[PDB]
């Protein structure tokens, strides 16, 4: 509350460390469904159904331009990528499996770096 604060967690390396995680996600072999924004002209249904599209290139540009206020808003966009993927893709498809794999990969790096 006013003039009553928990001890200050060092957040000075968060930007660098989110960039490193994002590099590791970009270079994973199963990243290919997620590297670029889904082409809303060429994929029927995507625009109407997926209210907030998100992809790794868009996270990279937001990260680089100071549009994440803190590491939690960064994790929300990463998770959005996978939640969108599960909304639109069967679990038993190459893309559906890619999304589960990447989400697992992310959540481990997240826990190991920050928790």
């Amino acid at each position: 509350s006013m003039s009553v604060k928990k001890p200050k967690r060092d957040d000075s390396k968060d930007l660098a460390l989110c960039s490193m995680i994002l590099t590791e996600m970009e270079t994973h072999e199963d990243a290919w469904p997620f590297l670029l924004p889904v082409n809303l002209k060429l994929v029927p249904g995507y625009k109407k159904v997926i209210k907030k599209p998100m992809d790794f290139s868009t996270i990279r540009e937001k990260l680089s331009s100071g549009q994440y206020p803190n590491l939690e808003t960064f994790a929300l966009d990463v998770r959005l990528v996978f939640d969108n993927c599960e909304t639109f893709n069967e679990d038993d498809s190459d893309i559906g499996r890619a999304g589960h794999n990447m989400r697992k990969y992310f959540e481990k790096k997240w826990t190991d770096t920050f928790k």
Side-chain angles (χ1 to χ4, degrees), residues 10 17 19 22-23 25 27 29 37 49 63 78 84 87 89-91 96 112:
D10 183 12
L17 286 157
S19 176
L22 180 57
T23 297
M25 277 192 310
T27 60
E29 69 164 293
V49 171
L63 195 63
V78 175
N84 291 343
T87 294
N89 295 265
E90 280 291 344
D91 294 344
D112 294 353

PDB file of all heavy atoms in Angstrom, residues 10 17 19 22-23 25 27 29 37 49 63 78 84 87 89-91 96 112:
ATOM      1  N   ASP A  10      14.898  -7.840  -8.891  1.00  0.00           N
ATOM      2  CA  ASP A  10      15.767  -7.237  -9.900  1.00  0.00           C
ATOM      3  C   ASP A  10      15.167  -7.669 -11.249  1.00  0.00           C
ATOM      4  O   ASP A  10      15.120  -8.872 -11.561  1.00  0.00           O
ATOM      5  CB  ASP A  10      17.224  -7.719  -9.807  1.00  0.00           C
ATOM      6  CG  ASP A  10      18.137  -7.023 -10.818  1.00  0.00           C
ATOM      7  OD1 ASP A  10      17.765  -6.011 -11.471  1.00  0.00           O
ATOM      8  OD2 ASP A  10      19.273  -7.484 -10.939  1.00  0.00           O
ATOM      9  N   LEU A  17      16.682 -11.535 -21.140  1.00  0.00           N
ATOM     10  CA  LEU A  17      16.341 -12.914 -20.962  1.00  0.00           C
ATOM     11  C   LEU A  17      15.041 -13.324 -21.818  1.00  0.00           C
ATOM     12  O   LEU A  17      15.031 -14.439 -22.398  1.00  0.00           O
ATOM     13  CB  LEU A  17      16.053 -13.209 -19.507  1.00  0.00           C
ATOM     14  CG  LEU A  17      17.286 -13.263 -18.567  1.00  0.00           C
ATOM     15  CD1 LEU A  17      16.897 -13.011 -17.107  1.00  0.00           C
ATOM     16  CD2 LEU A  17      17.966 -14.619 -18.732  1.00  0.00           C
ATOM     17  N   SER A  19      14.292 -12.008 -24.664  1.00  0.00           N
ATOM     18  CA  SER A  19      14.864 -12.078 -26.042  1.00  0.00           C
ATOM     19  C   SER A  19      15.569 -13.411 -26.296  1.00  0.00           C
ATOM     20  O   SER A  19      15.428 -14.034 -27.353  1.00  0.00           O
ATOM     21  CB  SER A  19      15.778 -10.877 -26.303  1.00  0.00           C
ATOM     22  OG  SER A  19      16.343 -11.056 -27.588  1.00  0.00           O
ATOM     23  N   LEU A  22      12.943 -16.140 -26.681  1.00  0.00           N
ATOM     24  CA  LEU A  22      12.233 -15.940 -27.942  1.00  0.00           C
ATOM     25  C   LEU A  22      13.148 -16.475 -29.068  1.00  0.00           C
ATOM     26  O   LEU A  22      12.660 -17.216 -29.926  1.00  0.00           O
ATOM     27  CB  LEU A  22      11.856 -14.509 -28.163  1.00  0.00           C
ATOM     28  CG  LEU A  22      11.099 -14.200 -29.458  1.00  0.00           C
ATOM     29  CD1 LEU A  22       9.849 -15.011 -29.540  1.00  0.00           C
ATOM     30  CD2 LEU A  22      10.760 -12.760 -29.564  1.00  0.00           C
ATOM     31  N   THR A  23      14.483 -16.203 -28.980  1.00  0.00           N
ATOM     32  CA  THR A  23      15.465 -16.786 -29.959  1.00  0.00           C
ATOM     33  C   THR A  23      15.417 -18.290 -29.997  1.00  0.00           C
ATOM     34  O   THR A  23      15.349 -18.916 -31.115  1.00  0.00           O
ATOM     35  CB  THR A  23      16.904 -16.208 -29.723  1.00  0.00           C
ATOM     36  OG1 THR A  23      16.867 -14.824 -29.961  1.00  0.00           O
ATOM     37  CG2 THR A  23      17.949 -16.954 -30.654  1.00  0.00           C
ATOM     38  N   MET A  25      12.863 -20.186 -29.141  1.00  0.00           N
ATOM     39  CA  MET A  25      11.560 -20.571 -29.734  1.00  0.00           C
ATOM     40  C   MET A  25      11.643 -20.389 -31.282  1.00  0.00           C
ATOM     41  O   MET A  25      11.251 -21.343 -31.986  1.00  0.00           O
ATOM     42  CB  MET A  25      10.391 -19.887 -28.957  1.00  0.00           C
ATOM     43  CG  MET A  25       9.985 -20.804 -27.524  1.00  0.00           C
ATOM     44  SD  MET A  25       8.511 -19.999 -27.160  1.00  0.00           S
ATOM     45  CE  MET A  25       8.822 -18.217 -27.177  1.00  0.00           C
ATOM     46  N   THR A  27      14.155 -20.698 -33.290  1.00  0.00           N
ATOM     47  CA  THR A  27      15.045 -21.672 -33.891  1.00  0.00           C
ATOM     48  C   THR A  27      14.652 -23.109 -33.651  1.00  0.00           C
ATOM     49  O   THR A  27      15.262 -24.033 -34.224  1.00  0.00           O
ATOM     50  CB  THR A  27      16.522 -21.377 -33.405  1.00  0.00           C
ATOM     51  OG1 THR A  27      16.566 -21.471 -31.989  1.00  0.00           O
ATOM     52  CG2 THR A  27      16.955 -20.001 -33.710  1.00  0.00           C
ATOM     53  N   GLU A  29      12.825 -26.530 -34.350  1.00  0.00           N
ATOM     54  CA  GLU A  29      12.363 -27.068 -35.617  1.00  0.00           C
ATOM     55  C   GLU A  29      10.850 -27.062 -35.848  1.00  0.00           C
ATOM     56  O   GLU A  29      10.410 -27.079 -37.018  1.00  0.00           O
ATOM     57  CB  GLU A  29      13.001 -28.406 -35.989  1.00  0.00           C
ATOM     58  CG  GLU A  29      12.635 -29.590 -35.166  1.00  0.00           C
ATOM     59  CD  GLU A  29      13.011 -30.974 -35.872  1.00  0.00           C
ATOM     60  OE1 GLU A  29      12.411 -31.332 -36.927  1.00  0.00           O
ATOM     61  OE2 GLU A  29      13.882 -31.725 -35.372  1.00  0.00           O
ATOM     62  N   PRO A  37       2.784 -14.013 -39.207  1.00  0.00           N
ATOM     63  CA  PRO A  37       1.350 -13.936 -39.044  1.00  0.00           C
ATOM     64  C   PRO A  37       0.579 -14.790 -40.086  1.00  0.00           C
ATOM     65  O   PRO A  37       1.081 -14.990 -41.220  1.00  0.00           O
ATOM     66  CB  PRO A  37       0.983 -12.476 -39.306  1.00  0.00           C
ATOM     67  CG  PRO A  37       2.230 -11.783 -39.532  1.00  0.00           C
ATOM     68  CD  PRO A  37       3.389 -12.718 -39.585  1.00  0.00           C
ATOM     69  N   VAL A  49     -12.734 -16.090 -36.620  1.00  0.00           N
ATOM     70  CA  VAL A  49     -12.679 -16.916 -35.450  1.00  0.00           C
ATOM     71  C   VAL A  49     -11.633 -16.475 -34.403  1.00  0.00           C
ATOM     72  O   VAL A  49     -11.902 -16.566 -33.180  1.00  0.00           O
ATOM     73  CB  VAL A  49     -12.346 -18.375 -35.923  1.00  0.00           C
ATOM     74  CG1 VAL A  49     -12.054 -19.273 -34.745  1.00  0.00           C
ATOM     75  CG2 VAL A  49     -13.545 -18.914 -36.751  1.00  0.00           C
ATOM     76  N   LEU A  63       8.758  -6.674 -28.679  1.00  0.00           N
ATOM     77  CA  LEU A  63       9.857  -6.775 -27.725  1.00  0.00           C
ATOM     78  C   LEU A  63      10.956  -5.711 -28.015  1.00  0.00           C
ATOM     79  O   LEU A  63      11.348  -4.946 -27.148  1.00  0.00           O
ATOM     80  CB  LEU A  63      10.450  -8.151 -27.654  1.00  0.00           C
ATOM     81  CG  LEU A  63      11.372  -8.489 -26.452  1.00  0.00           C
ATOM     82  CD1 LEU A  63      10.733  -8.441 -25.074  1.00  0.00           C
ATOM     83  CD2 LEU A  63      12.025  -9.859 -26.515  1.00  0.00           C
ATOM     84  N   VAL A  78       3.031 -14.942 -25.812  1.00  0.00           N
ATOM     85  CA  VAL A  78       3.566 -16.220 -26.230  1.00  0.00           C
ATOM     86  C   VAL A  78       2.400 -17.255 -26.104  1.00  0.00           C
ATOM     87  O   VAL A  78       2.159 -18.070 -26.979  1.00  0.00           O
ATOM     88  CB  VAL A  78       4.806 -16.664 -25.439  1.00  0.00           C
ATOM     89  CG1 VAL A  78       5.264 -18.018 -25.807  1.00  0.00           C
ATOM     90  CG2 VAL A  78       5.927 -15.712 -25.716  1.00  0.00           C
ATOM     91  N   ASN A  84      -4.332 -19.780 -29.592  1.00  0.00           N
ATOM     92  CA  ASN A  84      -4.882 -19.655 -30.965  1.00  0.00           C
ATOM     93  C   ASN A  84      -4.717 -20.906 -31.801  1.00  0.00           C
ATOM     94  O   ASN A  84      -5.641 -21.320 -32.562  1.00  0.00           O
ATOM     95  CB  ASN A  84      -4.274 -18.505 -31.731  1.00  0.00           C
ATOM     96  CG  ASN A  84      -4.696 -17.127 -31.193  1.00  0.00           C
ATOM     97  OD1 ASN A  84      -5.675 -16.965 -30.442  1.00  0.00           O
ATOM     98  ND2 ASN A  84      -3.959 -16.064 -31.638  1.00  0.00           N
ATOM     99  N   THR A  87      -7.191 -23.485 -30.730  1.00  0.00           N
ATOM    100  CA  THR A  87      -8.541 -23.087 -31.207  1.00  0.00           C
ATOM    101  C   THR A  87      -8.835 -23.503 -32.673  1.00  0.00           C
ATOM    102  O   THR A  87      -9.959 -23.909 -33.013  1.00  0.00           O
ATOM    103  CB  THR A  87      -8.801 -21.570 -31.033  1.00  0.00           C
ATOM    104  OG1 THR A  87      -8.830 -21.291 -29.663  1.00  0.00           O
ATOM    105  CG2 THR A  87     -10.161 -21.094 -31.651  1.00  0.00           C
ATOM    106  N   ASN A  89      -6.792 -25.697 -34.777  1.00  0.00           N
ATOM    107  CA  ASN A  89      -6.103 -26.851 -35.362  1.00  0.00           C
ATOM    108  C   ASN A  89      -6.438 -28.101 -34.484  1.00  0.00           C
ATOM    109  O   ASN A  89      -6.568 -28.023 -33.248  1.00  0.00           O
ATOM    110  CB  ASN A  89      -4.608 -26.751 -35.472  1.00  0.00           C
ATOM    111  CG  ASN A  89      -4.176 -25.683 -36.409  1.00  0.00           C
ATOM    112  OD1 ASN A  89      -3.921 -25.935 -37.569  1.00  0.00           O
ATOM    113  ND2 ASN A  89      -3.994 -24.462 -35.866  1.00  0.00           N
ATOM    114  N   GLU A  90      -6.749 -29.181 -35.187  1.00  0.00           N
ATOM    115  CA  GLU A  90      -6.928 -30.444 -34.478  1.00  0.00           C
ATOM    116  C   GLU A  90      -5.617 -30.830 -33.738  1.00  0.00           C
ATOM    117  O   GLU A  90      -4.494 -30.738 -34.315  1.00  0.00           O
ATOM    118  CB  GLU A  90      -7.430 -31.543 -35.452  1.00  0.00           C
ATOM    119  CG  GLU A  90      -8.936 -31.472 -35.732  1.00  0.00           C
ATOM    120  CD  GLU A  90      -9.821 -31.845 -34.547  1.00  0.00           C
ATOM    121  OE1 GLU A  90      -9.364 -32.455 -33.562  1.00  0.00           O
ATOM    122  OE2 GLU A  90     -10.993 -31.533 -34.603  1.00  0.00           O
ATOM    123  N   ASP A  91      -5.771 -31.418 -32.536  1.00  0.00           N
ATOM    124  CA  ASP A  91      -4.615 -32.012 -31.804  1.00  0.00           C
ATOM    125  C   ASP A  91      -3.801 -33.018 -32.642  1.00  0.00           C
ATOM    126  O   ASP A  91      -2.590 -33.025 -32.631  1.00  0.00           O
ATOM    127  CB  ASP A  91      -5.046 -32.648 -30.472  1.00  0.00           C
ATOM    128  CG  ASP A  91      -5.565 -31.666 -29.455  1.00  0.00           C
ATOM    129  OD1 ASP A  91      -5.389 -30.415 -29.537  1.00  0.00           O
ATOM    130  OD2 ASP A  91      -6.222 -32.150 -28.524  1.00  0.00           O
ATOM    131  N   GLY A  96      -1.120 -28.930 -34.962  1.00  0.00           N
ATOM    132  CA  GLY A  96      -1.721 -29.066 -33.632  1.00  0.00           C
ATOM    133  C   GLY A  96      -0.597 -29.621 -32.698  1.00  0.00           C
ATOM    134  O   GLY A  96      -0.432 -29.176 -31.523  1.00  0.00           O
ATOM    135  N   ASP A 112      12.391 -22.340 -15.610  1.00  0.00           N
ATOM    136  CA  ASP A 112      13.804 -22.383 -15.325  1.00  0.00           C
ATOM    137  C   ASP A 112      14.491 -21.038 -15.297  1.00  0.00           C
ATOM    138  O   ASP A 112      15.451 -20.883 -14.549  1.00  0.00           O
ATOM    139  CB  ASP A 112      14.564 -23.257 -16.299  1.00  0.00           C
ATOM    140  CG  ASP A 112      14.188 -24.723 -16.181  1.00  0.00           C
ATOM    141  OD1 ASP A 112      13.429 -25.120 -15.249  1.00  0.00           O
ATOM    142  OD2 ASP A 112      14.603 -25.451 -17.097  1.00  0.00           O
TER     143      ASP A 112
END
